[PDB]
């Protein structure tokens, strides 16, 4: 009969938006059977108090799925762990909205967690397809190492093995290091001149100001950086001509909620038409039984999707994070962010705007040297 779908949103207004979206989704296919009520809660400080709130405010109403969101004020120092751990005990699926850290891409830790954005590792796939079109082969990978280097570098290397071309010396550095010029000096005397950067926000600023003092960006030394490398520190600590990347939607939580409920509502009632249906446990305390139909709900929700909404066309992959995303190629020209192209899928589409390379040489620089 009545089913519930919880949510953990950022601000008060987003709760109203979620309620409006759930009402709209209910209004479409509500021919008896389901009514699809909703339950709400807001982000709270600390972390232990949060994991307790889920057990007494959300799980206490038989929630078929929890819906996380990024906190408004703080940075990624408080990415939502407790919801995944607490709800993961009963194998209750949780849908992510704007969480990108590449640690949830595996299921060894987060048993049941699937998002709607390619977190950070899929940026490596662009590096392959973008490199072919602009005629450069040999690369050097300059990456950090806390967890991104173990994943972002690994994905590119294993994907480039199909071409039988291997990357050059893949160096690394400890997080939050200073005077990295000794490590960079080893890279200075090498072959490839297409150095790829992929690190954290604070870390990337250190490399930029250090590389300037070593005259490593004057001509024919192209750069390639991820979304976070450019971010908000490109105003006063960046060279001229770094080709970054930016997600087309990103921080647009208003649109994602109107489509996150568009896939859950489609899949909840499909499961409701079946033989063995079991509701989830009523209370956290006193129960230690796994939700029997939990694995079934996770499987069907991961495969079908296909809800054609405002964010494009959602289609989850084999392990979580949604595939087929719309990227956009940035560029830096006189401290500006003019667009250069568009990535839709498996093919980069250039534009009619000429670009400027690091040195003003309006041409295709030779990577080999």
């Amino acid at each position, epitope marked *: 009969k009545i089913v519930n779908i919880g949510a953990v949103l950022s601000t008060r207004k987003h709760e109203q938006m979620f309620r409006e979206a759930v009402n709209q989704a209910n209004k479409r296919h509500g021919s008896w059977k389901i009514q699809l009520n909703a339950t709400s809660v807001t982000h709270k400080p600390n972390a232990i108090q949060m994991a307790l709130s889920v057990c007494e405010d959300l799980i206490s109403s038989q929630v078929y799925a929890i819906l996380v969101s990024h906190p408004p004020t703080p940075n990624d120092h408080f990415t939502p762990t407790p919801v995944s751990y607490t709800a993961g005990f009963y194998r209750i699926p949780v849908l992510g909205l704007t969480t990108r850290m590449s640690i949830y891409s595996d299921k060894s830790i987060h048993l049941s967690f699937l998002r709607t954005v390619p977190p950070y590792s899929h940026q490596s796939s662009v590096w392959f397809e973008m490199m072919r079109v602009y005629s450069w082969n040999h690369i050097i990978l300059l990456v950090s190492d806390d967890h991104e280097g173990r994943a972002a570098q690994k994905r590119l290397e294993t994907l480039l093995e199909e071409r039988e071309s291997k990357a050059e010396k893949v160096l690394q550095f400890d997080p939050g290091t200073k005077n990295v010029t000794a490590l960079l000096m080893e890279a200075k005397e090498l072959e490839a001149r297409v150095i790829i950067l992929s690190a954290s926000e604070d870390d990337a600023a250190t490399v930029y100001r250090a590389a300037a003092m070593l005259n490593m960006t004057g001509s024919g030394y192209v750069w390639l950086v991820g979304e976070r490398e450019i971010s908000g520190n490109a105003l006063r600590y960046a060279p001229d001509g770094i080709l970054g990347l930016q997600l087309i939607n990103g921080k647009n939580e208003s649109a994602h909620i109107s489509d996150a409920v568009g896939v859950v509502a489609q899949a909840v*009632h*499909e499961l409701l038409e079946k033989e063995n249906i079991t509701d989830p446990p009523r209370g956290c305390v006193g129960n230690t039984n796994i939700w029997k139909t939990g694995p079934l709900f996770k499987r069907v929700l991961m495969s079908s999707k296909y809800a054609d909404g405002v964010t494009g066309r959602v289609e989850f992959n084999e392990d979580g994070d949604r595939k087929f995303a719309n990227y956009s190629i940035m560029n830096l020209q006189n401290r500006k962010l003019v667009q250069v192209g568009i990535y839709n899928g498996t093919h980069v589409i250039p534009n009619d705007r000429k670009i400027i390379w690091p040195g003003g040489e309006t041409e295709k620089p030779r990577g080999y040297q």
Partner: antibody
Amino acid sequence: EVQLVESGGGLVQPGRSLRLSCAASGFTFDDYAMHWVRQVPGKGLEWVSGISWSSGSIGYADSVKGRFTISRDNAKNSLYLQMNSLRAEDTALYYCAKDRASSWYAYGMDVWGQGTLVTVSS
Amino acid sequence: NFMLTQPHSVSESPGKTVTISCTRSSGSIASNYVQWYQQRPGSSPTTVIYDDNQRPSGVPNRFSGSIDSSSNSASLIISGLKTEDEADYYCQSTRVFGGGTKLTVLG
């Protein structure tokens, strides 16, 4: 552009069977579900059945249930409606329609087909 | 279920505004959506207005939506124009279609 083509119907004696065919062109065949809406001469329209984007979500009307079956193939962009044990009151045209979402639950439809003709009589 | 009803026919000389209703049998009309269909005789039905008050790409505006509750009904409001657009209409909500009314221009 988007266009739906269907045919393969004619007068059939009562108690026999038939199998129409509806083919698509243009729009992607794997992204949108399709229905089967039938008219009635003189009177209004009515609903018959529907098919999901791939499979699994199959719906039927009241009298339609059990008598007819519906299946689709994603390779050659075709839609099939298999029926048997027709009656005298099932004389009408039959239209092919394409939905808007990836499922038949919304009951929405746009870009209708061109119709056909099937009649049951002695 | 229910039964959707509407007036049998309507006529109007060009220039003024025509009104077509579609009355719900049981339950609130706002519980589910409403859409209308445009079909010329001998042709195939095509969508004119869908999802309460919206127009698909190609509709020349003019036609407007109205889900005013009143006595549990839903009307169709069209601005003043006749031209060659005068034929039968159907209102569909969920698995059910309307009786069908036609627009007869006055000559």
